[PDB]
Design a protein around this nucleic acid. Sequence first.
RNA 1: UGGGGCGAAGCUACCAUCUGUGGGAUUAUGACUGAACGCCUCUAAGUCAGAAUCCCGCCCAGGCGGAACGAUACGGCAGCGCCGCGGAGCCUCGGUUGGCCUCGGAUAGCCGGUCCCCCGCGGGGUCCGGUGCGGAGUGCCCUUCGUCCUGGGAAACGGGGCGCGGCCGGAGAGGCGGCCGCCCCCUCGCCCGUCACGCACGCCGUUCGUGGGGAACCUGGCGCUAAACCAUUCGUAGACGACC
RNA 2: CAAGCGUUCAUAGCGACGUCGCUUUUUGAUCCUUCGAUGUCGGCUCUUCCUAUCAUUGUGAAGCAGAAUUCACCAAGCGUUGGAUUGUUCACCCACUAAUAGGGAACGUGAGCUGGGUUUAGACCGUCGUGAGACAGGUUAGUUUUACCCUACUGAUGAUGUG
RNA 3: AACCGAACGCCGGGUUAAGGCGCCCGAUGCCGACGCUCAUCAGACCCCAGAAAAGGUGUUGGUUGAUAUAGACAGCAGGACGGUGGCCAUGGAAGUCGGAAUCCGCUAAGGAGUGUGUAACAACUCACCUGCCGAAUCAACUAGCCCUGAAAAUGGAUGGCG
Lengths: 345, 201, 190
Amino acid sequence: SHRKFSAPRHGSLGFLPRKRSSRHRGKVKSFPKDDSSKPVHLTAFLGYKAGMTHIVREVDRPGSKVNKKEVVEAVTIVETPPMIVVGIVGYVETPRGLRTFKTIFAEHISDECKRRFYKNWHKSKKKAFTKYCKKWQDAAGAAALAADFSSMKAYCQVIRVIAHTQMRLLPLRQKKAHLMEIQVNGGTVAEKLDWARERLEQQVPVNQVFGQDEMIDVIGVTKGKGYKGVTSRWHTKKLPRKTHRGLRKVACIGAWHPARVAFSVARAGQKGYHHRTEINKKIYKIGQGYLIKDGKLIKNNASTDYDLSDKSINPLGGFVHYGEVTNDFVMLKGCVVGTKKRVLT
Amino acid sequence: EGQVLVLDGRGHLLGRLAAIVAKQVLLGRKVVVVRCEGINISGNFYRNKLKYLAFLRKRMNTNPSRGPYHFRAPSRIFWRTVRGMLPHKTKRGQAALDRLKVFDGIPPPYDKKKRMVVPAALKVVRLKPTRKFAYLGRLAHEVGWKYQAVTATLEEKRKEKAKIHYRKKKQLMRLRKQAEKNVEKKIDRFTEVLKTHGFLV
Amino acid sequence: MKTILSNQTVDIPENVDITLKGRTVIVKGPRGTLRRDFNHINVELSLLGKKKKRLRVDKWWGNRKELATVRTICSHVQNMIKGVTLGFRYKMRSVYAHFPINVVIQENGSLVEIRNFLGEKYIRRVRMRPGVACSVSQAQKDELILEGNDIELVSNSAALIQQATTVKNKDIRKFLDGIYVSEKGTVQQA
RNA sequence: UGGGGCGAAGCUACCAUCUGUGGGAUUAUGACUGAACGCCUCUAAGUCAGAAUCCCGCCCAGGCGGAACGAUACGGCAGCGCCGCGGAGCCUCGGUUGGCCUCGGAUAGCCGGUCCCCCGCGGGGUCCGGUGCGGAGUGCCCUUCGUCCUGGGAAACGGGGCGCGGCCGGAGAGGCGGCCGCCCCCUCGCCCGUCACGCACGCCGUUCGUGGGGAACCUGGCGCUAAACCAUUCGUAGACGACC
RNA sequence: CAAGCGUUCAUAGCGACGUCGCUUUUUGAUCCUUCGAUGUCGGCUCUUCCUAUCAUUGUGAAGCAGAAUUCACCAAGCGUUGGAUUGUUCACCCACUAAUAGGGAACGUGAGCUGGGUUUAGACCGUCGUGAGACAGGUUAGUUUUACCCUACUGAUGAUGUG
RNA sequence: AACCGAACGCCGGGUUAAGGCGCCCGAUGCCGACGCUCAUCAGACCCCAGAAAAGGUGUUGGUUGAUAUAGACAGCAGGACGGUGGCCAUGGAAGUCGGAAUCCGCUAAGGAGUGUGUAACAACUCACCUGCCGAAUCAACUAGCCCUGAAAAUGGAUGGCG
Ligand SMILES: [Mg+2]
Ligand SMILES: [Mg+2]
Ligand SMILES: [Mg+2]
Ligand SMILES: [Mg+2]
Ligand SMILES: [Mg+2]
Ligand SMILES: [Mg+2]
Ligand SMILES: [Mg+2]
Ligand SMILES: [Mg+2]
Ligand SMILES: [Mg+2]
Ligand SMILES: [Mg+2]
Ligand SMILES: [Mg+2]
Ligand SMILES: [Mg+2]
Ligand SMILES: [Mg+2]
Ligand SMILES: [Mg+2]
Ligand SMILES: [Mg+2]
Ligand SMILES: [Mg+2]
Ligand SMILES: [Mg+2]
């Protein structure tokens, strides 16, 4: 017999191998469509979550009840010091998918970047990238990187730029940088390459990638919550106070005919630590780190022109539960996925 | 015959071909069907789309990741149809399928090999000219390929290339024929003995 | 019953020069050149008349339903000839009670721009097909002129704006407004 | 948890806050051209518009599915990768010339040649001339298959030394070609003489792709010179396991 | 099919006398399976499917001017609520809306619950019985097991393969 | 189970029944006949495992009746009148809500009317009859093949593949 009294399902399936994520720096899954006409830019970056705050903006939505009123918007602040480009990488299109030719990273490399290779390192001899580098100065420094780029010019189509974060600058206890390919959505390969050629080894800050008031999408991993019963996980009903064996459950899993519990019935399971792509968040402010020309500029952070104090976004006693944001943040409308200190793509 | 087979899927009939492939796979002969986008089907476009979409609804309710795999690439689609004509539960049937091999477009090694055509699965022969149809390419697209565009642009790139070879090969034959005439009185009593027992007339 | 033969000759004028690539007829006269493929219909197109006087379409081992088509090819060919000699002109007269349908062509032909049909704020836009030169008439009040060589192309394009202009959730017995075709003719008449 | 105010941290609530994103095929339907059916016709051959549909895209998982590139065990005893070229021996098998290429049309094609014309040795065009139950035919082409003698003719610079360096071209999942110097060596396809090769005394797995695939060990040259896991710590995570 | 209604007019909408079907959400027949007993009514929760479309998208109808409305097509994409009474399924009313469509899955779902009703043993009235006692005639009290085992599913380690 | 053939010591060869013969899967890897149909739900075998009245110029055959070089059919042009507010009905019905009826002239041919519609006309149209064209045309039945009628619940079965 039918359900007497209809209702929506509890919690979407288009979402549902609700497992502990296999990765942790939010992997970008789709890089925007490179229209070959507009200039070369990077399409992504890699900040990290600090904390949050009361922003007060004047509004300009003619028609609304709040035209020209003050409102407070809750905002995150994403600590985003500049990212170093180490290596470039070329993808060719195929019937079978999108295979990768030729990864080439720089002479030099870094040391934080090294970290994101050999698991336990104080044990290691730190040998990574020691015979690669040797190529950035000889006769075979002209073969396998020159004939190579010529190759990546010829046959290749889509070019990303491997870039490692500067972990050192942060208050995190972490020293292990966050490498990621960031696609270049430029105009034409070669132009989209004699450029990455040039930005090897080189600082890349947030004001290249991003503009203040661009809608962006944040890609990161949900804040962890352990095993949860069905009522916390799938957010179901509770059964009444009477029930002999547990009231934080689902009564009926299935009909004693499709003789399997289904796909799509509510269950106990890992909640949180899930990968998630949140979209279309606004940038309220692109920041600037407190740098020196004489004696600090803490001012150049939270000092809007309509108040002109000398604040840093750092509240009194840090962003509780990591620390002080000492370089370029981006201030994002509302809340973003993930806990504090979290790598946020 | 012996050795590896290469069949050029274009202009064939999806299952009519696959029955012939599958017979020879079971006789130990290695077949390689190529260019499966080109493979075509009797009945009008939509008919077989509608018939495919019927497939896609067939799906193991209690978990679908177990349930039937409705592969979308024509290679894969055809494989399926060949496979249904093998006894693939058993060891000889899986050992059979391994002798098969199937591509969308026409790849390395197989660009570079001459390649054959089953007239008894060939559309112009098997069908009437006043009847309608799908290309498994377009069918495959509207069902969830991602790679009709790519395997187009690559095949156009291959065609342009292959044309060069065809033209250079064309130019060697013109040399052969001119060099027969430029030496036809010290091979004029060998060519004799050719044309006498049939060869070369 | 299969009919051994059916055929038809199109009488081609002295102006035009058709030249058929196998089955594909191309036609060039004064106005321009048209092309069309009968790579479906399956017939034998001969150009028997010397100097150049006859297209003859055969059909040959054909049953009833393909015998039909002898005459249809024969038509799209006359219909080309009239197009490349004379050229067609569909006129379409806007119609109303009240809100003046307010047309404005906007590259050359191409964009036919329609404010105010029935007080509607949404400005309907309509593309023409290639080779179809729309233009607002004169010597008459609410009246477009769609000029082109190709019937096929000229009459989708009539119909596109004739159909873009349709009322909804009313009596279309009563609400007799929109733009619609009044006169299918030619540019030059002879 | 003696009681109760207030209460950081942490969980957590349309009880606070933030964010929910795009294409394609077309149904019904509406249409264009237009046949049957010397008219009319949404259709018989052709087209067009068309959605909470369907499929896809963003989104989530990620294969007895692949990618790229890092480093490759100094040693106190180690063990290997190449490269080449050397000697035995478990085993697991299938095979027993190759074919090195257009595109597609099918009530049509193939090729030649352009005198002529346009484009980038090529491509396109036009004219003519041949083939088209196809003879620069997958009914297809090629290459040979007992050995060497030597002493004529026909044929004469062909081939070789894992002969040796350089420049190409080829990337869809290349794995292959191609094209140039120099050393030494050899003189082979077809006719013929002319002799020869254990002639095993009618007998079977004969012949090769075979320096197969893989698993164990005897020579030289050049390079090499760890990471992983545990323990510890941390928590970004928690049952334990897993992870940062 | 079709006699009629519909001012007129068969067939916008309807439609008699007849007649051809489906459907298994109604009850019957039947007695094929189970009596070394498959938990026997309702409610809650939770999935999924069907369409026999109540809403909404796109459409064709009307006796469609608008407004409002019914007929029908693709169509099952997302909807179908809060209560008073009632063991109830079933009902009726208030209320909201956009709708308050209809159904299936062992008459979906007792090692999910509850146990209100059925349907033990205690009891009470009605009637019948001479009586023990009977009564789809009323009424109040009445123990609701066991998961560790294979499976499905949800997560979690992992696995041969890639030196 | 129960249909069809066929009744079974254990084997080699040959041969068959009922069945089959793209491939699963043995056999058509006949240069097999002659047909019919294209299904936006095809069809595809005695039980047995699906449909009906009823539809259906979807196409193919008949059957019968028609029409016509005195030149039809179809197409484009002209008339479609008068005797005549004919009679009943008046509420209007002069051809026309309805009916008895109910025929002549001009004839060419025009029904005292098929309809639109009009309160009634008109105005329009249709029978009838002409003008223009050139040879086959039309109607009712009846069958063959397909289309519709045709709507169900874990996903989906000519056996599957096709
Ligand atoms: Mg429901
Ligand atoms: Mg209890
Ligand atoms: Mg209305
Ligand atoms: Mg569309
Ligand atoms: Mg249509
Ligand atoms: Mg369209
Ligand atoms: Mg009546
Ligand atoms: Mg039991
Ligand atoms: Mg329906
Ligand atoms: Mg209640
Ligand atoms: Mg039940
Ligand atoms: Mg129980
Ligand atoms: Mg149960
Ligand atoms: Mg009780
Ligand atoms: Mg009792
Ligand atoms: Mg008493
Ligand atoms: Mg008594």
